[PDB]
Design a protein around this ligand. Structure first.
Ligand SMILES: *[C@@H]1O[C@H](CO)[C@@H](O[C@@H]2O[C@H](CO)[C@@H](O[C@@H]3O[C@H](CO)[C@@H](O)[C@H](O)[C@@H]3O)[C@H](O)[C@H]2NC(C)=O)[C@H](O)[C@H]1NC(C)=O
Ligand SMILES: Nc1nc(=O)c2nc(CNc3ccc(C(=O)N[C@@H](CCC(=O)O)C(=O)O)cc3)cnc2[nH]1
Ligand SMILES: *[C@@H]1O[C@H](CO)[C@@H](O[C@@H]2O[C@H](CO)[C@@H](O)[C@H](O)[C@H]2NC(C)=O)[C@H](O)[C@H]1NC(C)=O
Ligand SMILES: *[C@@H]1O[C@H](CO)[C@@H](O[C@@H]2O[C@H](CO)[C@@H](O)[C@H](O)[C@H]2NC(C)=O)[C@H](O)[C@H]1NC(C)=O
Ligand SMILES: *[C@@H]1O[C@H](CO)[C@@H](O[C@@H]2O[C@H](CO)[C@@H](O)[C@H](O)[C@H]2NC(C)=O)[C@H](O)[C@H]1NC(C)=O
Ligand SMILES: *[C@@H]1O[C@H](CO)[C@@H](O)[C@H](O)[C@H]1NC(C)=O
Ligand SMILES: *[C@@H]1O[C@H](CO)[C@@H](O)[C@H](O)[C@H]1NC(C)=O
Ligand SMILES: *[C@@H]1O[C@H](CO)[C@@H](O)[C@H](O)[C@H]1NC(C)=O
Ligand SMILES: *[C@@H]1O[C@H](CO)[C@@H](O)[C@H](O)[C@H]1NC(C)=O
Ligand SMILES: *[C@@H]1O[C@H](CO)[C@@H](O)[C@H](O)[C@H]1NC(C)=O
Ligand SMILES: *[C@@H]1O[C@H](CO)[C@@H](O)[C@H](O)[C@H]1NC(C)=O
Ligand SMILES: *[C@@H]1O[C@H](CO)[C@@H](O)[C@H](O)[C@H]1NC(C)=O
Ligand SMILES: *[C@@H]1O[C@H](CO)[C@@H](O)[C@H](O)[C@H]1NC(C)=O
Ligand SMILES: *[C@@H]1O[C@H](CO)[C@@H](O)[C@H](O)[C@H]1NC(C)=O
Ligand SMILES: *[C@@H]1O[C@H](CO)[C@@H](O)[C@H](O)[C@H]1NC(C)=O
Ligand SMILES: *[C@@H]1O[C@H](CO)[C@@H](O)[C@H](O)[C@H]1NC(C)=O
Ligand SMILES: *[C@@H]1O[C@H](CO)[C@@H](O)[C@H](O)[C@H]1NC(C)=O
Ligand SMILES: *[C@@H]1O[C@H](CO)[C@@H](O)[C@H](O)[C@H]1NC(C)=O
Ligand SMILES: *[C@@H]1O[C@H](CO)[C@@H](O)[C@H](O)[C@H]1NC(C)=O
Lengths: 409, 694, 186, 48, 43, 49
């Protein structure tokens, strides 16, 4: 699932956009007020707010402790998609930036090939400019790599753990019993690699989340094209070129035609500024969402359904995206269910002390001899003091005397 | 001060006449008599400087100090001296081959009685043929001299006034403070501005005189003045600065006086101030505009072809309106003066064009429709007319630029070139078919052949004649008219339709370099295509001429000689101004452009960056976001940046006076290593401190 | 407010920005043409102000929900999540009024100097019958043996005591020791 | 929805809010002038 | 091809004189003399 | 091949222009016929064997 947390920072030369450097148009524009100063201040304000939002987001993502060798030193968990290997991006970040149809403008010498030889090349004729990002592509990837290397800290109250031990402690708190993990270590790792391989091979036009990454780029491209396409509209005048209006028509009627061009250009610029404000509000909401998603899913385990992906959350990985952040949520999806019955809590007929199930249920194996199983996997076992607690007696508790568990005897 | 509207305590953009920033002007010095003694002068009667939207004079200044006498070598206290100007419309030469003579009427401004009265007389100054005065073969200069205690009586010695209109006298109180004086000519007359209006407490200038002078002054000179007395006294130097049509950003105070302004094209920081309309700015990277990208040249080329046959309009007989003739002119150059010199035009109706622009301008075709029609029924050709002319004879197509010229040819010219009208003239007054309804005429079409053949067949007026033609019978009507004026002249109507297109635009006006204008903003007029842009020489179909863009923006031009020219808009290179409020220093970012391009467009940049980039080289660094000027590479890494430049790039403000180009470094977290063993290493603190985050 | 107030003086292509001057100077046919182009500018200004107020109302609704979350997670109780309730590790927060909103003063726990150390997942004897794990800390070691317990946010070696170590299940990665075992495990 | 539907009856300075009546009542140049100020109003409604 | 303005690599909404889709038109065929005299034509 | 009458005369279009590399048609002639054409017919012909 993908969240878009960055708008396209652009600056528009208002005077060149509206009047194309013609003194007659600039004389007629001054009776519409201080439009260019207001538009310049609005664009500078939204760009400054976007820079502050990026700084705050990356300061929230930053983790004080990380293990850079954890993603490479692991068991059968093929974690090479998020492994940092020139380019400091991981395999998934490179895959996201390569499979998307994004035209990155030349920030260092892009004027030399746009001219002297396309929204990255139409900015030098339409009088706008896409500002470069606040952080380099490498520097953002080091933040993402440090976050990925810090995933396997100790969940309880820093501490560096192997990835296998960390997913073991996550699935133990899921509800799967102690003895199941030791008997299915190989099967669990082989099941993890199958899901990651399926997510690797699904990068096509079939998954909706990558299509969101494409729609963000398409929205930015449509906004820039809509900004640049009003230089050809006449808006009812003889032509869209101010010089042709000045050459063809007399002084009294040039005012009418130039004014009806000016109103169209003003409407286009104001519509662009309002769109940038709405997109800035969306980016602020999505930035708060990304902060919450990172700090909860990537740095801990979720106790709430739906958030941190569907199913029941185990581990999440956050990587960079062309316009935002990309999250990979690994969940626990059970397949086959077995119907059973259990009790709120069992105890002897005297009701002196009574116990309750901890992270599971007290199932019955036959007509008697109550056992304990995990809440997420079926594995009956004798009741032990480390999987039950002493609680208050209740009137709905089961009364048993034939076979007493060692907490009850 | 901008006359017409008074402002107070605001900050707006003006577009009046102002001098450019850091203009030294021209400095003039007045001398004394020597130690009989002789005047001492400074060749000031030979220069006829251009007027050029007026000038401004800094009267006084450099005063209250120990100056230097010009004669000999002596020092004395400097005092304010009022300049005497001499303004005229036409120049020439004295009869000594020495310049400085103003023919016709001459506005002469000169002070009276040690600068307590200002006299501005405006009249002709005839030279007086005497010895050593103006108008003789032996002549050096004219000097306006006066003792210590009138200047016009000294002007009577050299020149002889004749036929003199007025003489305005203005009173001025003698002081020693610095005074501003300015002159400006408009449609009302020659306005005069001084800083002594509304009290004398500022350097702003307000209008105090409007002399009626209705022909434009183009030249001005300064009387060489010397005052009869070495170490006696000294006189100040007045400076004259020219007024240019440009923009300031001004700031008014509480009593509505200008206390500070900002020349928009002067610096990069003033381009920032003018682009945002604000004086006091905050630190940050901004986006500035070009306030110095005005065009500085001109270019005009067009295809040269044979002359169009516009002489067919004035031969054979004048056509009837019912049988008018049409000519379409393509692939030829046209001379419309051959049309407009033989006729007396007294009405033109045009849309999407003007007759002034019909003579110039290049089209794709030229459709001319002409017929004979009296001027008394010229409202039948008007738009929306319900008469029989506009529905059966001639319906005008208004989808294209047209000009309907109602012109007459007098009998002398028409008899010279054999233009005659002797047959009957008539128009179709009815064009019904067999069914009872009229056949209306489409826009821009000849009359219906069934009605036109029948109407041209008849010779007498009839309203409901039954014509046969071929097959179905058409009921037609014929009404006659006389196009010849009873004086003898013939009245014509010419409809000229001009078709514009983006193609080759072959038909162009008839008339009887680009390498010198490369790299500057110029006005180009190439094959009927007008606009603004700079030109470069890029590598090269060399027959479609204008290579376009997907947005139909012209990106290059193929010259006729074979070379390929590389145009761009005058404002195309994006400019970011890095301003720091604490240090009050500015730097410039030219984003996304390689740093060879800026060195070949120094004309369109600001007035200070042009002089920095034209005098030698260096100062330009190639970053990952562009070419900066005003930076220096420092190889320093920072963790936070108050002026973020781009891709992990800082800008350290100065504390020469150049910004430091630092990069953002990723502060690594405390690295921990994973465990193979059972034991796992931990990071625990041993010292803390409370921190707040508001 | 300045954008709303300063566009009354814009002529918008008319001869003047005053309706009375247009009515006095012009005939009844051109009065419509000039007054209409003033009217269009005024309507554009009012519609722009209303749309801007709608967007600002959206921002205010989102920030009001944010302030409710900040108060209920920072001020009335301390927060267990990083980044939220200020940077560092949250301890206490104060909320005060601001001109257009609310001001929060978050006080955090910021460590300065760190000491490297080694610890263990658990701690029990060679029999591996009952095993313990540290509570709110790690089981540090001061040499060959004699495992001790310190806090997770401050270094202070303390003897292992039953109120700071709960009994957990035995595990195959737990340490085995029989020399100076703590009283919970003896 | 009411604001979308009820601004089709506004003339916006034209002689009528119906294009057919404008084409019936005016010549070509005033047709071009008066239809454009209806068009601007409809574009403003759709963009809003 | 729309005269008066050229285009290059762009999808644009045109308007002009074009034939409607899936029109068969009118098919005319020529021949030789019927079988070298008596030429063979249609009406 | 295509024909079209305008206000400037009768235009003639063919696909052989610009090297004859496409099926698009470009203007190659403009006959000075200012009578608006109403009808057209196909003249029969037969080439010798
Ligand atoms: C377009 O047509 C007009 C009119 O035919 C041209 O104006 C003509 O220009 C010639 C060239 O100078 C003039 O001839 C001059 O005649 C005087 C004596 O009359 C002679 O002394 C000069 O040496 C010269 O030969 C002619 O008078 C003038 N005619 C008119 C009516 O103005 C015009 O030149 C044409 N445009 C171009 C670009 O050629
Ligand atoms: N006979 C005589 N006449 C004069 O008018 C005269 N004026 C001066 C004035 N000399 C000076 C010396 C320095 C600067 C000067 O430093 N000006 C700065 C501009 C800054 C400012 O002073 O306001 C400069 O740009 O040079 C000006 C005038 C001296 N002797 C004179 N002697
Ligand atoms: C400008 O001055 C010239 C003379 O330098 C004036 O020309 C004289 O005009 C008068 C009156 O028509 C004639 O009697 C003279 O014969 C002219 N002399 C010469 C040499 O041409 C001219 O009229 C003045 N201009 C104006 C507009 O008055
Ligand atoms: C030369 O000195 C005189 C007086 O010594 C100056 O005149 C004063 O200028 C100040 C400046 O605003 C005024 O406030 C006073 O009212 C003036 N006093 C008089 C008596 O006029 C004069 O400005 C000095 N000149 C220069 C160039 O500084
Ligand atoms: C109506 O006008 C047309 C053209 O304006 C005349 O046609 C010309 O006739 C002369 C002699 O009859 C020919 O030499 C020209 O070649 C014709 N030109 C064209 C374009 O057809 C026609 O004669 C006029 N009708 C009448 C009755 O005078
Ligand atoms: C991990 O997967 C990649 C492709 O998904 C594969 O090339 C690589 O060999 C795998 N590594 C292991 C250890 O299976
Ligand atoms: C268990 O015994 C207690 C006391 O005799 C009684 O209150 C309770 O209802 C019994 N539970 C069941 C499930 O019968
Ligand atoms: C002039 O403007 C300033 C702010 O720029 C303000 O403080 C001051 O009150 C204004 N003066 C008057 C008389 O209103
Ligand atoms: C002025 O020039 C003319 C010719 O140019 C010459 O005949 C005459 O002698 C010159 N007079 C003086 C004083 O130089
Ligand atoms: C001045 O007068 C002398 C003789 O008196 C004569 O030769 C000369 O031409 C005159 N010059 C002028 C300009 O009248
Ligand atoms: C100055 O005075 C002397 C006599 O006192 C006189 O001859 C001379 O012309 C005067 N200078 C003038 C009026 O310029
Ligand atoms: C100028 O001053 C003189 C004498 O001091 C006086 O007669 C005249 O009226 C004054 N003119 C003006 C316009 O003040
Ligand atoms: C035509 O020329 C003759 C001879 O020059 C002249 O007498 C006659 O007045 C001229 N016609 C007109 C209308 O002036
Ligand atoms: C006018 O016609 C006469 C008749 O012969 C001829 O001599 C003369 O040259 C013609 N003039 C012009 C200008 O065609
Ligand atoms: C044009 O091509 C030549 C051939 O390589 C090259 O040297 C030159 O730099 C090119 N010039 C431009 C402006 O591209
Ligand atoms: C600045 O210097 C460093 C090291 O000397 C170099 O790596 C860097 O590329 C330089 N930057 C520029 C813009 O030349
Ligand atoms: C903690 O650090 C501060 C600043 O480095 C120092 O002044 C203080 O003495 C330190 N306290 C201890 C116990 O080390
Ligand atoms: C502690 O002993 C048990 C049983 O002998 C063994 O399974 C476990 O691996 C031992 N722990 C270590 C750290 O060797
Ligand atoms: C437009 O031109 C580019 C480069 O010449 C080409 O790759 C592309 O296929 C063309 N068409 C479209 C629809 O972009």
């Amino acid at each position: 699932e993908f969240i878009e947390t960055s708008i396209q920072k652009v600056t528009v030369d208002c005077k060149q956009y509206v009047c194309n450097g013609f003194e007659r148009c600039e004389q007629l524009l001054e009776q519409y007020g201080q439009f260019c100063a207001k538009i310049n201040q609005a664009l500078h304000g939204v760009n400054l707010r976007q820079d502050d939002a990026t700084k705050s987001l990356f300061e929230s993502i930053r983790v004080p402790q990380s293990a850079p060798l954890m993603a490479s030193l692991s068991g059968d968990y093929n974690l090479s998609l998020f492994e940092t290997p020139g380019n400091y991006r991981s395999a998934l970040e490179d895959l996201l930036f390569d499979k998307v149809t994004l035209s990155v403008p030349g920030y260092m010498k892009g004027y030399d090939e746009c001219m002297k030889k396309d929204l990255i090349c139409a900015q030098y004729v339409a009088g706008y400019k896409v500002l470069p990002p606040l952080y380099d592509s490498n520097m953002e990837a080091m933040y993402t790599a440090s976050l990925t290397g810090s995933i396997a800290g100790a969940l309880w109250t820093a501490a560096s753990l192997p990835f296998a031990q960390s997913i073991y402690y996550r699935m133990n708190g899921i509800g799967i019993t102690q003895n199941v993990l030791m008997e299915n270590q190989k099967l669990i790792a082989n099941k993890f690699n199958q899901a990651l391989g399926a997510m690797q091979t699904g990068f096509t036009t079939t998954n909706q989340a990558f299509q969101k990454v494409q729609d963000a780029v398409n929205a930015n491209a449509q906004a820039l094209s809509k900004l640049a396409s009003e230089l050809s509209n006449t808006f009812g005048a003889i032509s869209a070129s101010i010089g042709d209006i000045l050459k063809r028509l007399d002084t009294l009627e040039q005012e009418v035609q130039i004014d009806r061009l000016i109103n169209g250009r003003l409407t286009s610029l104001n519509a662009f500024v309002s769109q940038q404000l709405v997109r800035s509000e969306a980016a602020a909401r999505s930035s708060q969402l990304v902060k919450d998603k990172v700090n909860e899913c990537v740095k801990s385990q979720s106790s709430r359904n739906g958030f941190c992906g569907q199913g029941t959350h185990i581990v999440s990985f956050a990587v960079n995206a062309p316009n935002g952040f990309y999250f990979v949520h690994v969940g626990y999806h059970p397949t086959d269910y077995v119907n059973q019955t259990s009790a709120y809590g069992l105890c002897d007929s005297s009701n002196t002390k009574c116990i309750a199930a901890k992270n599971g249920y007290f199932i019955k194996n036959g007509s008697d001899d109550w056992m304990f199983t995990g809440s997420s996997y079926y594995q009956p076992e004798p009741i032990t003091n480390f999987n039950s607690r002493s609680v208050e007696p209740e009137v709905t508790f089961q009364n048993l005397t034939n076979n007493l568990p060692p907490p009850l005897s | 001060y901008p006359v017409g509207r008074t402002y107070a305590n605001i900050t707006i953009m003006l577009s009046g006449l102002f001098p450019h920033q850091a203009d030294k002007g021209k400095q003039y010095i007045y001398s004394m008599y020597h130690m009989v003694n002789d005047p001492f002068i400074s060749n000031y009667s030979y220069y006829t400087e251009p007027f050029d939207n007026g000038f401004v004079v800094r009267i006084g200044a450099n005063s209250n100090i120990t100056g230097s006498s010009v004669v000999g070598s002596a020092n004395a206290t400097v005092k304010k001296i009022y300049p005497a100007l001499m303004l005229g419309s036409v120049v020439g030469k004295f009869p000594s081959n020495k310049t400085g003579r103003y023919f016709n009427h001459t506005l002469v401004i000169l002070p009276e009685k040690c600068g307590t009265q200002i006299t501005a007389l405006y009249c002709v100054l005839q030279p007086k043929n005497q010895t050593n005065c103006t108008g003789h073969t032996t002549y050096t200069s004219y000097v306006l001299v006066e003792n210590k205690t009138n200047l016009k009586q000294s002007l009577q010695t050299w020149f002889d006034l004749k036929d003199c209109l007025f003489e305005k006298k203005y009173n001025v109180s003698a002081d020693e403070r610095e005074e501003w004086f300015g002159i400006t000519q408009d449609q009302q007359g020659v306005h005069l501005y001084t800083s002594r209006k509304n009290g004398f407490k500022s350097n702003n200038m307000f209008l105090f005189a409007t002399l009626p002078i209705y022909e434009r002054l183009r030249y001005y000179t300064v009387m060489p003045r010397s005052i009869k007395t070495n170490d006696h006294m000294a006189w100040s130097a007045f400076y004259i600065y020219q007024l240019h049509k440009l923009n300031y950003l001004v700031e008014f105070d509480v009593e509505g006086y200008i206390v500070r302004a900002s020349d928009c094209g002067a610096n990069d920081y003033t381009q920032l101030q003018c682009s945002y309309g604000q004086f006091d700015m905050n630190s940050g990277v901004y986006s500035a505009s070009y306030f110095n990208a005005q065009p500085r040249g001109y270019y005009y080329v067009a295809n040269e072809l044979e002359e169009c046959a516009l002489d067919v309009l004035f031969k054979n007989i004048a056509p009837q309106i019912a049988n008018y003739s049409r000519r379409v002119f393509t692939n030829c150059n046209y001379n419309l003066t051959k049309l407009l010199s033989l006729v007396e035009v007294d009405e033109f109706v045009c849309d999407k064009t003007t007759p002034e622009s019909l003579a110039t301008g290049c089209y794709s075709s030229l459709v001319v429709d002409w017929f004979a029609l009296p001027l008394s029924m010229k409202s039948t050709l008007a738009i929306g007319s319900a008469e029989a002319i506009s529905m059966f004879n001639y319906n005008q197509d208004y989808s294209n630029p047209t000009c309907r010229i109602h012109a007459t040819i007098n009998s002398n010219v028409s008899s010279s070139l054999n233009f005659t009208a002797n047959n009957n003239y008539a128009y179709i007054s009815r064009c019904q078919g067999t069914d009872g309804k009229p056949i209306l005429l489409q826009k821009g079409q000849l009359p219906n052949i069934a009605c036109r053949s029948g109407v041209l067949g008849l010779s007498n007026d009839v309203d409901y004649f039954g014509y046969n033609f071929n097959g179905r019978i058409f009921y037609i009507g014929r009404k006659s008219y006389t196009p010849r004026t009873s004086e003898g002249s013939i009245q014509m109507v010419y409809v000229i339709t001009a078709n514009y297109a983006e193609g080759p635009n072959n038909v162009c006006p008839l008339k009887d370099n680009l390498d010198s204008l490369l790299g500057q903003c110029i006005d180009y007029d190439i094959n009927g295509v007008v606009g603004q842009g700079v030109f470069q020489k890029c590598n090269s179909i060399p027959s479609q001429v204008f290579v376009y863009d997907s947005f139909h923006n012209i990106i290059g031009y193929h010259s006729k000689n074979g070379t390929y020219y590389c145009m761009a808009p005058c404002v195309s290179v994006p400019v970011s101004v890095i301003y720091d409020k604490s240090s009050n220093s500015h730097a410039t970012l030219y984003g996304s452009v390689a740093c060879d391009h800026i060195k070949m467009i120094p004309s369109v940049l600001s007035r200070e960056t042009a002089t920095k980039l034209r005098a030698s080289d260096n100062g330009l660094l190639q970053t990952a976001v562009g070419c900066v000027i005003g930076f220096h590479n420092t190889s320093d890494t920072v963790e936070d940046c108050n002026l973020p430049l781009g891709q992990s790039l800082c800008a350290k403000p100065p504390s020469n006076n150049t910004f430091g180009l630092a990069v953002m470094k990723y502060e690594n977290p405390l690295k921990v290593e994973v465990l193979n063993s059972s034991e796992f290493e931990i990071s625990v603190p041993t010292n803390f401190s409370f921190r707040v985050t508001e």
